[PDB]
Design a protein around this nucleic acid. Sequence first.
RNA 1: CGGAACGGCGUCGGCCGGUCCCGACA
RNA 2: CUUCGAUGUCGGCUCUUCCUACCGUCCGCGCGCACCGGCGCGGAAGCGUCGGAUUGUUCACCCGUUCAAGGGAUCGUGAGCU
RNA 3: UCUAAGCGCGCACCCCGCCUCGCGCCCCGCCCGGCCGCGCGCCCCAGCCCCGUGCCCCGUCGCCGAGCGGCCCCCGCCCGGG
Lengths: 194, 270, 170, 130, 47, 184, 98
Amino acid sequence: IVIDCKGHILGRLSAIVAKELLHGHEVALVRCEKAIISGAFRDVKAHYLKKMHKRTNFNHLRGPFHFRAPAEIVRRTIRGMIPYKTVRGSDAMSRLRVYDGIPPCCARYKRVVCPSAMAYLCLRPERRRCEVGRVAHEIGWQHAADVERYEKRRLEECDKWYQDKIQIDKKIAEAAEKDAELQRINAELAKYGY
Amino acid sequence: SHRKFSCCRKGNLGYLPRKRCTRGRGRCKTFPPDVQGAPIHLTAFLGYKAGCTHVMRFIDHRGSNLHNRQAIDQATIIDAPPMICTAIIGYAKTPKGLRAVTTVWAAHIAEPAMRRFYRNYFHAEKTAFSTYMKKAADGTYIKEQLGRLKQHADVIRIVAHTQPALTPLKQKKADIMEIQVNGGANVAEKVDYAYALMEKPISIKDVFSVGAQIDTISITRGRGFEGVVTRWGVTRLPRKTRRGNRKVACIGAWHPANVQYTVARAGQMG
Amino acid sequence: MQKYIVYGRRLPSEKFPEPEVFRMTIYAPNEIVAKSRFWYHLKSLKKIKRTHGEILDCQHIEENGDFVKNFGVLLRYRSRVGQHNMYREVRETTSARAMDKVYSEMAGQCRARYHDIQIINVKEVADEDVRREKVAMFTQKGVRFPHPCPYVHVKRAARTARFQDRAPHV
Amino acid sequence: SYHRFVEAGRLVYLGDGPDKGKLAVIVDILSTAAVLIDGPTTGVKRQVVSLRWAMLTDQVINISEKPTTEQLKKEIEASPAIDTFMNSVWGKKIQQQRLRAKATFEDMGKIAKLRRERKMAMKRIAMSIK
Amino acid sequence: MEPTLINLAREYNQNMMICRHCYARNPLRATNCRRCRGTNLRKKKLS
Amino acid sequence: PLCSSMTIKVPTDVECTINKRVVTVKGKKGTLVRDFSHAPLDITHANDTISVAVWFPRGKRNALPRTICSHIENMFKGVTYGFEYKMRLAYAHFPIAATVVDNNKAIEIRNFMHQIKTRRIECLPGVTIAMSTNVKDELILRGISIEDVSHTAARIHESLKVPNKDLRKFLDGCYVSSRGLQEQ
Amino acid sequence: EEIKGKTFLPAIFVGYQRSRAKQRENVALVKVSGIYTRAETDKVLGRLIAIIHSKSGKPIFGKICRPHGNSGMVRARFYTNLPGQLMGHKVRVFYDNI
RNA sequence: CGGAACGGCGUCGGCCGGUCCCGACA
RNA sequence: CUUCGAUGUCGGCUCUUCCUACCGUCCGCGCGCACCGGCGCGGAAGCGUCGGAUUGUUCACCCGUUCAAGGGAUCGUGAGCU
RNA sequence: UCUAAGCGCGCACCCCGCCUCGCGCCCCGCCCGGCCGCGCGCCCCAGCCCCGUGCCCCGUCGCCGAGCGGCCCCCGCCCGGG
């Protein structure tokens, strides 16, 4: 399951993702920079800076690790919602991939969105929301420019590919009059309605 | 209870872990910023410290006591035998971080650089670059690959090797260093400049100028295992201390129970 | 939620062979609570304790509710400071249905539970007589308003397991 | 906020409640939260329903103020609103959705086999159109 | 300094109200200080 | 059905287009675009008037319709007459010299309080700074946008700040004297 | 095998019926694809199910028994109690009788 | 959001009055 | 209440860390803010808060300087010392 | 009317750079191989531009090739001097 993280609440989607990982669903989350954390940015930065204050005093190396990159922040959120010390849960964390942007062949995978966990429906207009990407630039991420420049290139290429898909799809739909018609008649008209 | 008196911590915790350096030689790490459009220039060189001299210079600092006065000042001579370009490396700016597109090596690699690739050259196989030389040597392989760098690479660097035979050193093998081509009007101009110096020596006089400021990166002299007083500058305790005066007396409070990274401890000093 | 007319009188005495009968319109969840409220009132209003008197008849009056009417409720609630008096108007189909809306808005806004609030009176008020604007805006002949919560169709997304291909438009 | 406004006569497709899946008309508005809805020809008995359970539809029926249930039925019958809405894309889906609800396990088995024939066929059709 | 220019400058620097707690500069007619949130005490002092 | 609605009237000279909550207004002095998508408003054109209409104005949403109506009308005023915000430099002993430098695109204020530091304030895009020859020691800021002119003007007043002292005794600076819809 | 062409409906073994305190390793909670309400479980109640043993490669059969919650999940019992390394693995509810 | 006396033109809901088409120096 | 088949009990010395209820420096703002210097207040814990005479002293007291806040860590710190 | 929308400026603090380490990964050279998978419109939510669907069969008959991706693979000491 590849889920675009754009417009999604961070916790609400992480909870769906966690149940899927534990049910063996192999999820990949893309565009994690565009996920949303509710609340005014100033207060969400203070909450993400207060977390980085808590570090083991004797050796900071042995203590909590705070991940600046948004994809890593999303992975740590799902880790809190997963039994990761147990093997059932370490095997769940293993089947999870978090990506900022749609980078390798995640681009060619079909992508889905969880409507309920999306911000527009989840939080009232005038709630005040921020994107994980800007919170992460302020806590330390150095690659926000990089994932913008790249994402612009992918979107430009996608537009060219779409026009190519549009004409081919007209032929594909036109050609769909074979035994597809027989299946269609015996699938929906057979009163299944599907 | 309160420390009772105000003193700074002894030592910079930034320079921790104070461990022997695991890189083979000092490594440039960050190269100066590009400032695209500048006169095309190389940014770094490798040299061997030769010694110190002391010079008498005329000072022109205005509003200084030493203005229009002569000053004897220490100088360090670094021997800088000419380095020879051996490769062109291009790195794209990727959302992961600078990612190397490819390294197009020279048609011919000199014996000093080649001796770096093996632990004992006399008894070695001598198999390195054997196929590469045949694939190249027409110039087509070098130019077609160089074109790939122009399309994808955003940062162009050049690999160069020192000539240790022109030095009084006992090294024989040559250090390979990446020097970034900087200030090009465009990356293709950087690749064209980079190919002009390929297989050809580059001199310290070309890379730097007099009056310019440079930063020298190197591994410090070693002093071996060293105690807290030499390694961290702690005060030696009173003579009456049993078990010695050269020690940090209190390594911490009862709580935190564990000893902390901040407290000074004995170990490698160089 | 129900609406009952609980009738009651003190038990006949030698001094008073026929005692006066009291009738009270009590809105309550069930007959048992309705008869408790009737005696809570008669104990204070008429000095008739439950053990002193008897309930002649508890009669559930059901109502026809096919048309919306503005029901005005006057009540007294005891807050953390002390008893206060309040008049609330609710537009609803039936008097029992508007008492539910009043006790929903008394717990939510005034934080008063059913046993703290005592209803002085419930009486249907016509459009001209409405004194509260939240009820008045609706009373005007034609009310056109956008759907107040059109994003609430996220009930659809719980079924979808939140794995829809496109983000649904509202 | 621009079209589809809660008003008298607005046809509503109930999306929650006992009437889930049944259309109705908003006879009156109690408040922002609730409306009185009646579906004389659609099987909804007049009741007060929270606007959350009533998805708005484009069609608005012409009703008199306070039109009872029988008079509403004559007015609802007179309007072509219900018939046009079932000819609509939403109405066409609602009819298909109704059939999908009454599917037993044996029906579901035939449906999922037929779905596989479509999935494989699409690949066969799209392999020709390369 | 010109007197007319002095008035404009003093409107910017002298004319004002000061909450006795927030010490915040407040509008010439104010009932509450913005920073001290409703402090009803305010004044300002002439040179 | 509550909807706080304020309607302005579009000036005939101005041509106004609203798409979503972004308003593009063009008259004689030039086009101004402002985006009000932060706020939830039913901006409605047609006729010759713009109604803002915020539905369900429960809390501070009642404040929004007048604010947006004022903003659209401030835009309509600027694209016609234009906004000028005259500012007068005030000094006691030290003449302050302000020189318009980048072809009416920056101001350079020097000799403020005999301060060696020279302060250059660049104007926001689309605002010109000039020195009123008639008024004397006055700088006229002219542009279509009211808030660009006003931001440009307050930066001017924020640079010229006496470092400490008593501000009531030491009043020296650039102070906006006249803010008005006038002369571009 | 016994099951080669059986069409089946994908399902998942999501863990044994349990409380934080105790696990009843006799009953197994199964999420059936296409069942989202307790009422919908009625259709898949009593139907045959099977999980493919990871080591054996041979199906362990079972029957769906009673609905676990309001969410359509069902409680199922198998000939042998499931191992626990099969949690998250897919169970198959066969459309045909056997 | 352990917590007080006290403040709050934060936002909804009341209670009790005055001015109110006798439209709240002209 | 815990420890009496034992948690080494004052101070110093050494060395680390922390707190803010901030003394100086930073940023605002108010003054009975002309300047100079003070004084109040809000944010602010990065750095500084020392050298000595007497006392075992913690504290105290005085001298001096670049003028010198208050604390916590088993009253931090004895298989570190004295 | 500095705030409610919106905007500007803004602290020795904070974060980052520079720097110290650095698991991993990368390119290259030797080498040139094996294995696995099959799936892309984007934006917007007070225009939501016609919605309120789809998928619902990862073995369930699906696995060719190609392409786009992944993964594995591979890389000596002694001895002497610093």
